[PDB]
Amino acid sequence: MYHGALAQHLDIAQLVWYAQWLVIWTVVLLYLRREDRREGYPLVEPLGLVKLAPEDGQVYELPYPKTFVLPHGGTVTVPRRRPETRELKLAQTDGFEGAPLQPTGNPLVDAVGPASYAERAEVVDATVDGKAKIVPLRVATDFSIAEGDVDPRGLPVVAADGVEAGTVTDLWVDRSEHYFRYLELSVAGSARTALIPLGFCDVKKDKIVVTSILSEQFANVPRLQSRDQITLREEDKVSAYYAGGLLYATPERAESLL
Amino acid sequence: ALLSFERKYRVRGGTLIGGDLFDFWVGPYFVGFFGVSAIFFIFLGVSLIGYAASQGPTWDPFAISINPPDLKYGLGAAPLLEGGFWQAITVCALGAFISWMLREVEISRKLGIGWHVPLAFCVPIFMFCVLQVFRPLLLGSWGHAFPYGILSHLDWVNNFGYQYLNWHYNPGHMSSVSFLFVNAMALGLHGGLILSVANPGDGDKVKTAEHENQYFRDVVGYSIGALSIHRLGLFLASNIFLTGAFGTIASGPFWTRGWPEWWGWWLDIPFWS
Amino acid sequence: CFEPPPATTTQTGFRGLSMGEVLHPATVKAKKERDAQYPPALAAVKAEGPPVSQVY
Amino acid sequence: ADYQTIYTQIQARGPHITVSGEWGDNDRVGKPFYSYWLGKIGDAQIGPIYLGASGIAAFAFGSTAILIILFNMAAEVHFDPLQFFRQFFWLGLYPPKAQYGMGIPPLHDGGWWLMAGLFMTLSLGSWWIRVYSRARALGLGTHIAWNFAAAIFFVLCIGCIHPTLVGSWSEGVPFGIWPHIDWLTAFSIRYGNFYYCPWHGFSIGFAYGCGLLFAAHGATILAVARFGGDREIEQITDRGTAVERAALFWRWTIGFNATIESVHRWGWFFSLMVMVSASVGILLTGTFVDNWYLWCVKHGAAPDYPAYLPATPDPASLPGAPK
Amino acid sequence: SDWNLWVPLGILGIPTIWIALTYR
Amino acid sequence: SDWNLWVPLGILGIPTIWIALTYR
Amino acid sequence: ATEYRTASWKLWLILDPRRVLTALFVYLTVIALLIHFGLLSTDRLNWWEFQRGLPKAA
Amino acid sequence: ATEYRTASWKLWLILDPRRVLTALFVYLTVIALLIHFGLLSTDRLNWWEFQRGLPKAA
Amino acid sequence: ATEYRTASWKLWLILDPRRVLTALFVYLTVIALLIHFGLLSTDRLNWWEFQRGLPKAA
């Protein structure tokens, strides 16, 4: 006679096994996976045949909507229907479902592929007080660089060519993270400051090296609306431009190695 | 077949090898040259397992095993059923892994994002290589590698570890284990913290980044900060294998005694002995 | 401390199971030298005469 | 390379803003200081800390525990200070070595073990409360508390619950570096090999899972840090190119993706599950399964191998065997 | 007692002198 | 005692000289 | 300098007494312990214990 | 320079007394330790103990 | 060049004394240690210990 024996071959351990499984899958499927479809669903179709319903099992799929009450007023409902209405300057190679696309004009200005941004809300990012979160060091006068680092203010910005694009005007700080996000440089040749994300420049002792894009295309980095604060959308715009240059600066960046 | 925002990103180029002929998506999957290659290994390698398992002595999924060749065969090929298929699969395996990793590189190129993901995926690949390839080279036989088999593989792990008398004491292991634990705990905290801020309960407003900080600086009195946790996660994760790899390679080629005996160095400093 | 390669290895169980001994060739040599001082057998003698029980 | 993901090149300093709690804004303690080196991987600022009651208590019990532990470890080397410090990893506080079932064991054999056990238990709890309360104090959700919970429960299982269900304190984990580890082997040997227990399986699955997931999530965020994807919360409420890419990347690879929000759920879930899976296994063991291998053989899960050297019948079972 | 075991004196002494004289 | 074996002397000495003379 | 012969003293303008003081304090303390304990872990030169040194005796 | 012969001294314009000082302190300490302990771990050449050497004795 | 012959010296315009100095320091130290301990781990050429060499003797 044994502890935990339900028959001559059936024991409580064995049953628990399945039980365990059951739960795992249930959570995974009937929960986690639903939670995953809060963004970008339901699926869209630009070739296939009369479909208002993804992989099948799934048009329930989408969970019922949440309602994020936001810190500084307002509500967001998730999932949503946020429509893309920018008119993309992309021609298709083939009309085919999953055949890739060719940019028609300048991809960096027409904002497609790695140079595309998301249409974020056109508002300034804020602190817990209600100040602007991301500001330059002309504004956040209280903030400073840690003693022992290189102040990049004054240095030459060298682009992909090996050509000086201009000179560093300022740093921009995140006020709620104590972290530097942007270099504001003065694009030489024009009368303009352009903002580069700090993740696109290797800061040295003497120079700032910018591999991303060529010297000539610093002239076309998206213009800021205000002088001293940046909206959420403007951020995406600025970032996307340089990253797009990682595929579109020179013609050879397209191509495979052979 | 597309996410509502997917189209603007689906552009040509940024393949590592052989340009436009393989540059397409099948459904949600991006293929590319390495896509094709991966598939080929996966298909062949799996089929090969099946055939091999068919001429085993069972079909219980736990109990099926494809073992490597005896030690007498050295670094050479073995008869197909006496360890050869093992060899076969192991190559399909490597094959698949690497094709997987490169595919990822192609993908990331196309998106203008960093290559961190592929590279991160490189770490486990290396450990696989360490266990199946290097360590057996250094001891000069394939028979030193581990067999493919759900329960079977553990038997290998088990005996291996008792070959040095108590693997727990092997210092490479210690480090790896520590990381494994820290990583798990840390994922929990990171998980929770985001979730708490997002879903604060009731009709409470979603909280800010400052609340994340406050929370930890209260409980344990330090906050690592938002970017860096991500950075740190990647680090912990990775040394699971990086440090372990040392302890693994050591055992056999560089140490042949029980692992506890090795701490003798400290235990036996003649000053306080 | 980090005992240098190679290693003598044998197989004591089925292939792929990682069973068998693992020796430092050096150490074995040393032991083998030590276990060699075993003095060699004495020269055999012709069994001649009575049993010792009657002698001593 | 991109240096800005690995470490921080230019550090910032400035006034940190305190989020006022629901209560206990008063019980923050210490002069906050900076570490320039630490500033290269994370925030540099290191104080203050919240105190309050739960803390006080946790420390209270925690310390008592520690004291009892150490003191007994000293007593093992007979208080020789030099030897203590040399032998330290090999010293421990052990549970009872005789069979007393579940009776409170004599001081010298497991008695002290038990006391420290109880106090460790109490600190864990006090701490739990800290974690849980603080959350509520700052209007957050309670997820961390619940994860932490599971961890604690698993400690309970191997500490007293399992001992209890089989009904002997002898089965407790000992305190001490090496000796808490020797426990692992003993315990495994006793219950007929833990590789063969399914919950040990599950657990490990989820644990490696965590590895995979953090590496992945970690790597993903850094890969998209150039678009400010590390700003994870604003990404939840106002989806930017950052996480759009991140999603796409994963979709094009394994063929389905998450959201910036939900990936966190996955991670949180996997974490939890390590501890839970574990607890189950521990509870089943000794209670319903006696020898996990044999059990796997009864359900034919266990692989069987041919003999390499000749097969060996157990000598105990021969004609005319001794004992 | 150093009997042609001036060895350490050689090693110790020589540099001692040139360290004296070279940096003046 | 350094007899027949100037090996180290040569190895040590030769460079010592040309290091002296080359870099003036 | 109050009738000083060397400039030695300027060291404290370079070095910082507080560091030196604190370091010596520790440094010394440790060496001291090493010697004490280390001695008392031999057989000759252990005061504190019976001569289980058994000097040559047996 | 106040009545010097070489320019040796200019080294300290280049190198930094405080580094050299702190380094040497450490360097010598370690070496000193190695030798001391090292010696006291032999058989010949251990003061601090009864002659473990069994010098030729057996 | 104050009565020089070669330009050898221009090396220090290119190299940096401090790097060279500090490295040589370490490099040499390591080789030194290597040789010392190396030697003292043999049988011939160990001073510090009784002639374990059993030079031919046994």
Ligand code: BCB
């Ligand atoms: C009695 C023997 C023991 C032992 C023997 C041991 C050995 C011999 C080794 C370890 C190793 C390790 N052990 Mg230990 N171990 C550990 C934890 C660990 C890990 C941290 C570490 C690395 C695991 C590994 O190598 O992954 C392996 C994972 C690999 C190689 C990656 C495979 C992934 C691949 C790239 C991709 C696969 C894709 C799939 C095929 C796709 C299929 C999926 C679907 C979707 C198609 C814990 C926490 C414990 C406890 C709690 O006791 C423990 C006890 C023991 N270990 C027992 C004491 N362990 C390793 C180590 O680092 O040692 C120092 C190691 O060599």
Ligand code: BCB
């Ligand atoms: C040095 C130690 C090693 C080790 C130690 C070990 C232990 C101790 C345990 C396992 C367990 C497992 N291991 Mg092993 N392992 C496995 C895969 C497995 C699974 C069978 C299982 C759970 C894995 C998991 O959840 O991870 C994280 C990944 C997740 C959650 C994503 C899904 C992965 C999926 C679960 C695994 C799919 C693999 C397939 C079942 C088989 C191969 C593919 C098919 C198509 C042919 C692979 C594919 C590899 C290699 C080399 O590619 C390998 C190498 C090793 N494991 C090293 C040799 N592993 C556990 C087990 O279940 O054993 C019974 C277990 O207890």
Ligand code: BCB
């Ligand atoms: C020879 C013996 C083995 C063994 C013995 C074994 C046992 C007996 C158990 C496990 C368990 C587990 N094993 Mg296994 N193991 C594992 C990994 C794992 C873990 C997933 C899981 C343990 C849960 C855990 O994470 O503990 C770490 C987390 C802990 C302990 C929670 C701590 C949280 C706590 C709140 C900490 C805070 C403490 C405070 C700071 C207090 C301070 C103290 C003061 C008061 C003094 C791997 C990866 C391997 C490999 C690779 O081989 C392996 C092989 C082995 N295990 C060998 C086969 N393992 C457990 C399990 O899952 O069993 C089914 C388990 O019970």
Ligand code: BCB
């Ligand atoms: C059988 C042979 C023996 C032997 C043979 C022997 C030799 C041959 C020598 C010594 C020497 C020494 N022995 Mg000795 N020895 C000593 C200790 C000593 C030291 C007094 C001295 C080590 C000097 C040194 O190494 O500088 C290490 C560190 C130094 C010098 C640092 C100071 C200089 C620093 C660069 C300047 C900066 C100072 C600043 C004010 C502080 C800066 C602070 C920073 C951190 C901010 C002890 C305690 C014992 C005991 C307890 O048995 C002992 C036994 C023996 N020794 C055996 C009996 N020993 C050496 C000596 O010179 O005697 C005095 C020596 O040559």
Ligand SMILES: C/C=C1/c2cc3[nH]c4c(c3C)C(=O)[C@H](C(=O)OC)c4c3nc(cc4[nH]c(cc(n2)[C@@H]1C)c(C(C)=O)c4C)[C@@H](C)[C@@H]3CCC(=O)OC/C=C(\C)CCC[C@H](C)CCC[C@@H](C)CCCC(C)C
């Ligand atoms: C410290 C680093 C951690 C880490 C990191 C990362 N992990 C990653 C990535 C990163 C960054 C990815 O980017 C990549 C990915 O895509 O994201 C999901 C990935 C992935 N990690 C998988 C499994 C995984 N990660 C493990 C471990 C860690 N991950 C450690 C902890 C383990 C353990 C520990 O067992 C497992 C099982 C797959 C899901 C997936 C690749 C699929 C593949 O490889 O496609 C190619 C191959 C197949 C789909 C099948 C292969 C069939 C072959 C030909 C033949 C059969 C197999 C044969 C070898 C038999 C063995 C079975 C036997 C043992 C019984």
Ligand SMILES: C/C=C1/c2cc3[nH]c4c(c3C)C(=O)[C@H](C(=O)OC)c4c3nc(cc4[nH]c(cc(n2)[C@@H]1C)c(C(C)=O)c4C)[C@@H](C)[C@@H]3CCC(=O)OC/C=C(\C)CCC[C@H](C)CCC[C@@H](C)CCCC(C)C
């Ligand atoms: C998969 C799930 C994982 C997981 C999850 C989670 N894990 C969490 C949380 C979650 C969610 C938390 O929320 C909580 C926490 O907050 O972290 C931020 C926590 C924790 N997990 C810790 C350690 C840990 N997690 C481990 C494992 C896993 N976790 C598993 C793997 C392991 C392993 C693996 O061994 C370890 C060691 C601590 C950091 C913390 C407990 C603090 C405590 O309970 O306090 C108890 C208080 C004390 C012990 C008092 C201290 C007294 C001092 C030292 C002085 C004594 C000296 C004395 C002699 C004299 C007095 C004088 C004096 C002035 C000098």
Ligand SMILES: CC(C)=CCC/C(C)=C/CC/C(C)=C\CC/C(C)=C/CC/C(C)=C/CC/C(C)=C\CC/C(C)=C/CC/C(C)=C/CC/C(C)=C/CC1=C(C)C(=O)c2ccccc2C1=O
């Ligand atoms: C229709 C038509 C024309 C047909 C004819 C065409 C035809 C037949 C053509 C030929 C077919 C050819 C050539 C090829 C076939 C297609 C192909 C290339 C297939 C490869 C497929 C393959 C092997 C797939 C297997 C997938 C796989 C390996 C693993 C599955 C995934 C697993 C097990 C993952 C582990 C579990 C896990 C960690 C889940 C995590 C959850 C997620 C989603 C994590 C990822 C994730 C992370 C980590 C984030 O940090 C994050 C941050 C912000 C936003 C999102 C995310 C996010 O999604």
Ligand SMILES: COC1=C(OC)C(=O)C(C/C=C(/C)CC/C=C(/C)CC/C=C(\C)CC/C=C(\C)CC/C=C(/C)CC/C=C(\C)CC/C=C(\C)CC/C=C(\C)CCC=C(C)C)=C(C)C1=O
């Ligand atoms: C943003 O929101 C959030 C926050 O901010 C609000 C948070 O703060 C937080 C979290 C709050 C916190 C306080 C986080 C802190 C939590 C932690 C667990 C931090 C603790 C981390 C540790 C203790 C480190 C782990 C160390 C161990 C486990 C001991 C290991 C023992 C030994 C002997 C290890 C020996 C070997 C090493 C130490 C290193 C070995 C390294 C190598 C061999 C190679 C190194 C590899 C590299 C450097 C990478 C390669 C280099 C490049 C790619 C450039 C979260 C979660 C949240 O996300």
Ligand SMILES: COC1=C(OC)C(=O)C(C/C=C(/C)CC/C=C(\C)CC/C=C(\C)CC/C=C(\C)CC/C=C(/C)CC/C=C(\C)CC/C=C(\C)CC/C=C(/C)CCC=C(C)C)=C(C)C1=O
């Ligand atoms: C069109 O059909 C095809 C495709 O498209 C459908 C393909 O994609 C492919 C895939 C072909 C490719 C080159 C894919 C792109 C290349 C990669 C992704 C790199 C990764 C590839 C590999 C790691 C291995 C591939 C190379 C081979 C399999 C060549 C085989 C070489 C030999 C010697 C096989 C003959 C066997 C012997 C001589 C016996 C002695 C050799 C052994 C015992 C070794 C086995 C033991 C091991 C531990 C293997 C470890 C060594 C390795 C993994 C290289 C093929 C093959 C196919 O033709």
Ligand SMILES: CC(C)=CCC/C(C)=C/C=C/C(C)=C/C=C/C(C)=C/C=C\C=C(C)\C=C\C=C(/C)CC/C=C(\C)CCCC(C)C
């Ligand atoms: C009903 C009755 C009568 C009693 C019930 C009692 C009860 C609740 C029993 C349950 C007991 C439990 C949960 C026991 C758990 C024991 C466990 C899990 C022990 C596990 C691991 C412990 C380890 C690894 C500890 C080693 C500890 C040391 C080496 C020394 C401790 C010191 C430190 C951690 C350093 C801090 C000290 C420093 C500040 C000076």
Ligand SMILES: CCCCCCCCCCCC[N+](C)(C)[O-]
């Ligand atoms: C042994 C622990 C492993 C638990 C299994 C992990 C679940 C993998 C997620 C599959 C997602 C399925 N899908 C494609 C419908 O989303």
Ligand SMILES: CCCCCCCCCCCC[N+](C)(C)[O-]
């Ligand atoms: C991943 C861990 C492996 C052990 C799992 C045991 C599987 C039991 C299911 C097999 C069917 C036979 N059974 C239970 C009816 O006897």
